[model samples]
Target: FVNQHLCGSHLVEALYLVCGERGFFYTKPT
Candidate 1:
């Protein structure tokens, strides 16, 4: 399921967390 979701409460300052098929993803800074 890509393991992707908004951290904690999906708030604006929340982090983007993701993990898929032995892989992973996240937000750094835009």
Candidate 2:
């Protein structure tokens, strides 16, 4: 799974706070 080190959606708000833009997390096991 992706963002495993990022702690999932926990960094979403932090990302926007630092970059001023909303961010999403996508995973591709295949």
Candidate 3:
């Protein structure tokens, strides 16, 4: 399971969030 830590999907945004393990949304098991 991923962090589901989302970004770069739809439109404009502002932030520098973090993720676990493989990182990014649905990359791999965290």
Candidate 4:
């Protein structure tokens, strides 16, 4: 089964911050 990495609002915020605007496209993993 597939599951979303951003499970909740807080998780989404954290993912957004970590991913940034471009997300994996503009930057590399840290």
Best by lDDT: 4
Winning model by TM-score: 4
Model 4 score (lDDT)? 0.58
Q: Please list the C-alpha lDDT of all candidates, in the order they appear.
A: 0.43, 0.54, 0.36, 0.58
Model 3 spans with C-alpha error above 4 angstroms: 1-19, 25-30
TM-score of 3: 0.15
Give the Cα RMSD of candidate 3.
Answer: 9.4
Over 1-30, each residue of candidate 3 has an lDDT whose tens digit, in order, gives 244554554211222233434345334445
Task: Measure candidate 2: CA RMSD.
Answer: 6.6
Candidate 3 colliding pairs, count: 0
> In candidate 1, what are the lDDT values of residues 1-30, reduced to their tens digit?
335664545533333333334453445667
Span of ten consecutive residues with least summed lDDT in model 4: 1-10
Of models 1 and 3, which has the larger lDDT?
Answer: 1
What ranges in model 1 sit over 4 Å off? 1-21
TM-score of each: 0.18, 0.33, 0.15, 0.40
Error of 1 at 4 (Å): 12
Local distance difference test, candidate 3? 0.36
By lDDT, the candidates rank as: 4, 2, 1, 3
Model 1 gets an lDDT of 0.43
Least accurate stretch of 10 residues (summed lDDT) in model 2? 1-10
Better candidate by lDDT, 1 or 4 = 4
